[PDB]
Amino acid sequence: NDDPHILAPVFPDRTNGQLATFANISRDANLSIPKDYTTWFIDGQEVESGTDSDKEINRSLKAGTYNLKIEVETVKGKKTSREGLVVVNPLADDPQSKEVAFERIVSPGKTARLYGSNLQNVTAILLGGNTITDPTYVESADENYLEYTIPTGVSEGDYRIVLQDADGNQYGADMVKVTNASLVISGANRATANVDWTISGINLENIASLTIGGQTVSQFSNQSSTEITLTCPDLSDGSYTMTGKTRSGEAVQFLNDNITTTEQTVTVSTEITLWSGHHYVSWDKPDGDPNKTFGLIPMDVFAGITAGSTLKVVYSIEPTAEYHKMQLATGYWTGLASEMEFTENGEYTLILTQDMLNKIQAEAGFLCVGHGYYVDLVTVK
């Protein structure tokens, strides 16, 4: 007739600002882990203990990461609770699926996708009091995925999903966040004044206007559920606030390190052209040939550039060339980055360290070395 805290066994505690490691097992496996005057919870739900005792747990749940709570109360009212994580690893041959990056944020009435393994098997998907009849496995030049159409009736919220096969076996698919809100998920942190700015999110086809540094934009280059292109207003270099409102009138939300907000910090930068033209580069040319390298941006220019600036070299291929390789170097040909074998056009970007800037002055300036390509544009921001 007293007050307890640590009954056997020994449980580990949190290292950072994130929950305890705890149990890690398999899809088939079972979760097995004061006096007698002295409950189990999964993702915030009261559950039965496998056995008869309120200390001996036997639990076989579907694959995925879970939130376990061992909140035990005595006859009087002594308060000692344990909160931790329980990880259930699926079987190799089982239809696995985890989140790779933001595809789990889904919208009602719309398509969605799952990246994993064996999803070719998934005849149906289960999302909280619903059965998804049409799961289509789509074939890609990149990672393959399984497409599904989120039902209209589904209200907002976090849901655990199921992957049911032919027989009906039902396997472990992790967490899915459902939203109708116009939520900007990426590429808002940084923007360039007067150039196109392409922002990606979820219900962006409903964004009516976006406001950066007070300046409002209502006209958009492209607009759909996933993405939106606009022209970042003519703002001085600096950190601004971006807000936005829907066709309806609600505030456009902003996901950032999983923290949803109503305001976004945008870092506006201005892109200064250091050179334009169509300069071919071939190290096979003789020494002294203007086209052995690209070095038309004098040293004095590179001295000007402040540490952290972002150099971009717009390159274009020479179709007749047997190979296309390039590299950003000093005048002494010291590489500032790795060599690059490429086959199509593109833009090479490089943040310029104070060291890189020093090497530039120490070593005869900046060069664009390589074979079979054209330097078309060099810019800084």
Query: What does the alpha-carbon distance between residue 191 and residue 218 come to, in Å, rounded to a whole number?
Result: 17
> Would you list the domain boundaries of the chain?
1-89, 97-178, 183-269, 272-380
Token code pair at residue 231: 């022209």
Architecture label for domain 97-178: Sandwich (2.60)
Half-sphere exposure of residue 47: CA atoms within 13 angstroms, side-chain side? 21
Q: Give yes or no for a contact between 105 and 183, defined as CB atoms under 8 angstroms apart.
A: yes
Which residues are within 8 A (CB) of 322 and not within 5 positions of it... i.e. 6 or more apart?
372
Angle CA 232–353–239, to nearest 5: 30
Closest Cα to residue 126, out of 172, 90, 86?
172
Architecture label for domain 1-89: Sandwich (2.60)
Q: Give yes or no for a contact between 253 and 261, defined as CB atoms under 8 angstroms apart.
A: yes
Domains 1-89 and 183-269 share a fold: yes
Peptide bond into 9 cis (omega under 30): yes
Distances, alpha carbon 268 to alpha carbons 111, 193, 241, in Å: 33, 6, 10
Query: What does the alpha-carbon distance between residue 125 and residue 133 come to, in Å, rounded to a whole number?
Result: 7
What is the SS3 assignment for 186?
A: strand
Query: What does the alpha-carbon distance between residue 38 and residue 256 come to, in Å, rounded to a whole number?
Result: 44
Distances, alpha carbon 86 to alpha carbons 25, 57, 161, in Å: 8, 13, 17
Distances, alpha carbon 359 to alpha carbons 171, 348, 355, in Å: 56, 19, 6
Q: What class, spelled out in words, does domain 183-269 have in CATH?
A: mainly beta
Which residue, chain included where needed, has tokens 């490429």? Answer: 342
Which residues are within 8 A (CB) of 145 and not within 5 positions of it... i.e. 6 or more apart?
103, 113, 114, 115, 119, 137, 138
Peptide bond into 319 cis (omega under 30): no
Which amino acid would we find at residue 238? G
